[PDB]
Design a protein around this nucleic acid. Structure first.
Ligand code: MG
Ligand code: MG
Ligand code: MG
Ligand code: MG
Ligand code: MG
Ligand code: MG
Ligand code: MG
Ligand code: MG
Ligand code: MG
Ligand code: MG
Ligand code: MG
Ligand code: MG
Ligand code: MG
Ligand code: MG
Ligand code: MG
Ligand code: MG
Ligand code: MG
Ligand code: MG
Ligand code: MG
Ligand code: MG
Ligand code: MG
Ligand code: MG
Ligand code: MG
Ligand code: MG
Ligand code: MG
Ligand code: MG
Ligand code: MG
Ligand code: MG
Ligand code: MG
Lengths: 143, 70, 63, 56, 145, 55, 206, 141, 63
RNA sequence: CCUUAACCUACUAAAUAGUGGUGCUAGCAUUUGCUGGUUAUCCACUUCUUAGAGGGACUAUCGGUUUCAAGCCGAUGGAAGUUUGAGGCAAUAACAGGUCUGUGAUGCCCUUAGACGUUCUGGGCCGCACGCGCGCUACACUGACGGAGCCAGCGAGUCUAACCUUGGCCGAGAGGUCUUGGUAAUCUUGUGAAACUCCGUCGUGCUGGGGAUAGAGCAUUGUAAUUAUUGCUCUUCAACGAGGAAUUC
């Protein structure tokens, strides 16, 4: 029939790209993983421990696919949630541009995204290629 | 701290032999059978479904629901 | 336990010092041709159906 | 030069507010009655509308 | 995940670091009823300890428990960030410690003694038993002492 | 702004607005007509601006 | 049901039911009748709906409260106690879950058993605070159907809210618990009690 | 040049534009199918127009919709309005009138404001309160 | 409370007095009439002066 | 009357708004197809968006009720039928209401060089047994936490200057650093807001609800941060288990 990733529902795609980015083994996982907290506006680290770098890799990937070009900042603001300033009201806070900037470099190094012109990070022709592929792999699970 | 955070062999086979007649089974219904707290009662759900007994007729978080084997 | 259904026929006016009561003439459906006037609690329009819990008693003014 | 358009248009109104004052003091005994400011090439034109122009 | 079984392997309550630890809690949260061991410090240590966080404080090998202690009171050796730590840059030998169990109480006292003994207005302030951090005092805090 | 100079009263707030309307038209022409059409068509209070170029 | 497809495909039971019966989440609006005279015109049930969410202008006039699909009344009354003010997706989902629960217990269209629990907790007559002179006796009044519906819903939700507070059991379990008990009066539900009692003190001062 | 109409749907500030060309029958929103949509609980709110008039009706027509503005629920209503208003905008112009008027009939019959945009809008907040009616809090003395 | 001001009811007066041949139980033609016949300063007021002339008209006809 | 929020496939239009075609091009399917990219490669439009000019509603049609009066009520129609929603404006008169602490508006009085003038240094308005008010965060399971889904509108922004700030690296974080666009429907910005949705963890235990109080280290604004301007990490883990009489909206 043909396929995109937009044809695949947001979460089971991102679990799909996750289980597959894990299979692979290729990645680069800086090294401060597990010992880190994704946001100043966060309490506990993620519970994936050995992982989640894959999930946000999948998340980052898919999101870059859906559009022109996006940089580390827009990902901070995206991946940024609500911090309880404790007894003081909540305020939106951006999450860490380290987790993202190293994710974008690890997906660029594995050639699924590319330092787009104008600014940001365009999705790679080989990324297009392989996302739509595992997309199809994800629908084909459901046959 | 009021019991039901572990497995005690008799509790296993009690689960196995007590979940018919349960038209309603869920996190709250297993706790209510004076046993397993929400951590391991959710494991008892994922493993009673490993084969038999519970029919999954409800989806997700907080809420869950099963019935007896037909 | 003898229920006695009665359909509002006309709306009379609010009673009670507060003004939440509504006076109303009702014809009970099980054998019409006989009226009683009751005092309600909720909102009411014409042709509703009230469950008169006891059949023969009526009121008028409220304070 | 080089200002925002908003800031420019407000700034012009302050320019009006002050001018009207300076005349409303200065020309009291000449029956001053209001100004207008007209902008052109070459010049910047202010017209005193007062009821005794031989004393202005 | 999986219904487990075990035998009499797990003994509830187990004492470490001069404090006591309830069994039958998700271990990570058990090390926090020790002093100086928050939810993040506990987390990272067990992660670094090669332990199953899934597990309760119940199971756990003795060998594990001891590796847990080792990591807790020797952070910078087991390559823990040091900014992850409650007592950076001491103030005498200037090393970075993570003071734990009955000892945090000591240093809390130790520090305050320095302030008082130097006569600094934060000492004076702790001494009068007030709020130090500068918060207004007219209205807030009445029941108190 | 609050209506009162001072502080007493209910806290009546007012609100002032000035309306800035912008328009632009593009024309191709010689130099004579631009200069003819721009010195005249003068209007006090309206801001006329004439640039040039394709950058 | 004669399946059809085009490009973007429409799943099986989706295609199926929709074009066929115009039923709920996937429950039956046909059959289900308000087992009480009166209360009809004040319980909806037809036109059927899919889920309990509507850009409903049920407020701008006096009784257009009464045309509202009755399930969407229940759900609407779920989302309160401030922290849950708004949050209709929350309430609506709790209803679907709740309805899935009732149906497991004793079958019956669970939307029907909801029709029954609403009818079976409306106070046939209540009391009001008359003047009568300083010391104010209690006049027995006959409460409107519309008040009987409203009060049934307000009772049933609050009672289930009160039990859901501070225990493992989730809202929908106790809701469905409340409605199941209330369906055929058994005095074990907070609503059946409070109805039965308002009718005891309304009888005592007449 | 193929036959095609464009429409829109508006609840609160959410506007939803909808193109209705002649095709093999897609039903896509922004860029993803109408099987996704999620809200999900609300999903059958946007299926609704398809099912009130027959899924069949869409086999000669490709349908794309893109939504900007509003909020999560404010978009689910705007789209389904755009779809139904589109389905009758194609029968107004291409197929005959009787049929269109038989679609406005089983749409407005059951309804949910499918062809009729809701007029409800935010009220202004006024001074003295944190809402439009909600005044503050006085204590007298 | 949709009670017509005096300026409305009074204009409706002088119109129906002097332009009763012309005018008819139709607002829309009465409205346009009020353009070609009467000098009002606002659309809103004109439709008020009209839709009311239309009412009076509508009931001069049965007495 | 004005203003704003609602209705115009009618009018005038738009590379600072957008849409359809075409080129140039990516991917997935290949049988056409699906889903992106390309401030000008052109062609066409104006539904979406913008604001000019209009139109529109007059509680209209019909029916109830009313002295068959002004009006009220119900239905249908309708973008709209509570003064269409919400404001702006607003007579006569009154108070010893507030304001000499907004005014280089002012009478009168005080003071005027050992100053009640002005400025500089430092402290104070923050001082804490405690009464009163407005509030913020909470007591959790319609919940906290962690992944992930991911959606607004009113704004505002740098010249003789340092404002709004994308992107790239570095940094756990706060932040840093080299660059960048915008005097702005053009850049920040689609302000990828937050509740919220979803899949998990926890499981009623002052618990993983709550985050006061405090310790230690790191940064940012500024000449200056001690009595801790703010931000961050770790640790410390209070009271509060729904709140008397009362009382706001
Ligand atoms: Mg977000
Ligand atoms: Mg998030
Ligand atoms: Mg601790
Ligand atoms: Mg508001
Ligand atoms: Mg072909
Ligand atoms: Mg082809
Ligand atoms: Mg237009
Ligand atoms: Mg209507
Ligand atoms: Mg108006
Ligand atoms: Mg006085
Ligand atoms: Mg003054
Ligand atoms: Mg003076
Ligand atoms: Mg001042
Ligand atoms: Mg003055
Ligand atoms: Mg002085
Ligand atoms: Mg002060
Ligand atoms: Mg006071
Ligand atoms: Mg106040
Ligand atoms: Mg969450
Ligand atoms: Mg915007
Ligand atoms: Mg560092
Ligand atoms: Mg520059
Ligand atoms: Mg407690
Ligand atoms: Mg605690
Ligand atoms: Mg917390
Ligand atoms: Mg200081
Ligand atoms: Mg001080
Ligand atoms: Mg300050
Ligand atoms: Mg309370």
């Amino acid at each position: 029939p043909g396929v995109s990733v937009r044809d695949v529902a947001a979460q089971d795609f991102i679990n799909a790209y996750a289980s597959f980015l894990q299979r692979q083994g290729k990645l680069e996982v800086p090294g401060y993983v597990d010992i880190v907290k994704t946001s100043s506006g966060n309490e506990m680290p993620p519970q994936d421990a050995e992982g989640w770098f894959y999930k946000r890799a999948a998340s980052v990937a898919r999101h870059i696919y859906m559009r022109k070009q996006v940089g580390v900042g827009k990902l901070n603001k995206l991946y940024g949630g609500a911090k309880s300033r404790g007894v003081r009201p909540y305020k939106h806070i951006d999450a860490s541009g380290s987790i993202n900037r190293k994710v974008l470099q690890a997906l660029e190094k594995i050639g699924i995204v590319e330092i787009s012109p104008k600014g940001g990070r365009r999705i790679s022709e080989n990324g297009q290629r392989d996302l739509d592929r595992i997309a199809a792999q994800t629908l084909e699970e459901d046959e | 701290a009021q019991h039901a955070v572990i497995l005690d062999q008799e509790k296993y086979d009690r689960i196995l032999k007590e979940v018919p007649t349960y038209r309603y089974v869920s996190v709250s219904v297993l706790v209510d059978r004076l046993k397993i707290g929400g951590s391991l009662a959710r494991i008892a759900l994922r493993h009673l479904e490993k084969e038999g007994i519970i029919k999954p007729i409800s989806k997700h978080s907080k809420q869950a629901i099963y019935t007896r084997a037909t | 336990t003898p229920v006695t259904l009665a359909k509002v026929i006309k709306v009379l006016g609010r009673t009670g010092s507060r003004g939440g009561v509504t006076q109303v003439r009702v014809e009970f459906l099980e054998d019409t041709s006989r009226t009683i006037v009751r005092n309600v609690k909720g909102p009411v329009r014409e042709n509703d159906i009230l469950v008169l819990m006891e059949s023969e008693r009526e009121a008028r003014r409220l304070r | 030069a080089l200002i925002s358009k908003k800031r420019k248009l407000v700034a012009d109104g302050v320019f009006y507010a002050e001018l009207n004052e300076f005349f409303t003091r200065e020309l009291a005994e000449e029956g001053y009655s209001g100004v207008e400011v007209r902008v052109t090439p070459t010049k910047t034109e202010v017209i005193i509308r007062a009821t005794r122009t031989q004393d202005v | 995940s999986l219904v487990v079984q075990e035998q009499g392997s797990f003994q509830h309550i187990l004492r470490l670091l001069n404090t006591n630890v309830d069994g039958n809690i998700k271990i990570v949260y058990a090390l926090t009823t020790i002093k100086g061991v928050g939810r993040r410090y506990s987390n990272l240590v067990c992660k670094k300890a090669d332990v199953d966080l899934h597990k309760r404080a119940g199971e756990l090998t003795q060998e594990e428990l001891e590796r847990i202690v080792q990591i807790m009171q020797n952070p910078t050796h087991y390559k823990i960030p040091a900014w992850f730590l409650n007592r950076q840059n001491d103030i005498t030998d200037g090393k970075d410690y993570h003071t734990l169990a009955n000892n945090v109480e000591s240093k809390l006292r130790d520090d305050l003694e320095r302030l008082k003994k130097i006569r600094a207005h934060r000492g004076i302030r702790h001494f009068w038993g007030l709020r130090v951090r500068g918060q207004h005092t007219k209205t807030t805090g009445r029941r108190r002492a | 702004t609050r209506k009162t100079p001072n502080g007493e009263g209910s806290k009546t707030w007012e609100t002032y607005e000035m309306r800035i309307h912008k328009r632009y038209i593009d024309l191709e022409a010689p130099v004579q007509i631009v200069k003819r059409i721009t010195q005249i068509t003068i209007e006090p209070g309206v801001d006329v601006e004439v640039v040039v170029a394709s950058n | 049901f004669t399946p059809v497809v085009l490009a973007t495909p429409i799943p099986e039971e989706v295609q199926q039911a929709q074009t066929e019966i115009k039923l709920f989440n996937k429950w039956s609006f046909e059959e289900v009748e308000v087992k009480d005279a009166s209360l009809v015109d004040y319980v909806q049930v037809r036109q059927p709906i899919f889920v309990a969410h509507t850009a409903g202008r049920y407020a701008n006039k006096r009784f257009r409260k009464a045309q509202c699909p009755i399930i969407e009344r229940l759900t609407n009354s779920l989302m309160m106690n401030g922290r849950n003010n708004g949050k209709k997706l929350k309430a609506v989902r709790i209803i679907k879950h709740t309805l899935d629960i009732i149906n497991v217990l004793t079958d019956q269209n669970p939307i029907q058993v909801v029709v029954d629990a609403i009818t079976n907790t409306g106070p046939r007559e209540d009391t009001t605070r008359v003047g009568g002179g300083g010391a104010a006796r209690r006049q027995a009044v006959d409460v409107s159907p519309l008040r009987r519906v409203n009060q049934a819903i307000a009772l049933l939700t609050i009672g289930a809210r009160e039990a859901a507070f501070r225990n493992i059991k989730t809202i929908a379990e106790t809701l469905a618990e409340e409605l199941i008990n209330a369906a055929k009066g058994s005095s074990t539900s907070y609503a059946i009690k409070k109805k039965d009692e308002l009718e005891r003190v309304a009888k005592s001062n007449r | 040049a193929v036959p095609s109409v464009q429409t829109f749907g508006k609840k609160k500030s959410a506007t939803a534009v909808a193109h209705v060309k002649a095709g093999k029958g897609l039903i896509k929103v922004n860029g993803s199918p109408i099987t996704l949509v999620e809200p999900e609980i609300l999903r059958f709110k946007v299926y609704e127009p398809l099912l009130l008039v027959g899924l069949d009706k869409f086999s000669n027509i490709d349908i794309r919709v893109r939504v900007t503005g509003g909020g999560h629920v404010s978009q689910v209503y705007a789209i389904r309005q755009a779809i139904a208003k589109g389905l009758v905008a194609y029968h107004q112009k291409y197929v005959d009138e009787q049929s269109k008027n038989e679609l406005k009939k089983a749409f407005t019959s059951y309804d949910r404001t499918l062809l009729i945009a809701d007029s409800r809008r935010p009220e202004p907040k006024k001074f003295g309160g944190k809402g439009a009616r909600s005044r503050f809090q006085k204590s007298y003395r | 409370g949709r009670v017509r001001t005096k300026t409305v009811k009074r204009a409706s007066k002088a119109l129906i007095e002097r332009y009763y041949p012309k005018l008819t139980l139709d607002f829309q033609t009465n409205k346009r009439l009020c353009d070609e016949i009467a000098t009002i300063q606002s659309k809103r007021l004109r439709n008020k002066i009209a839709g009311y002339t239309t009412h009076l008209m509508k009931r001069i006809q049965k007495g």
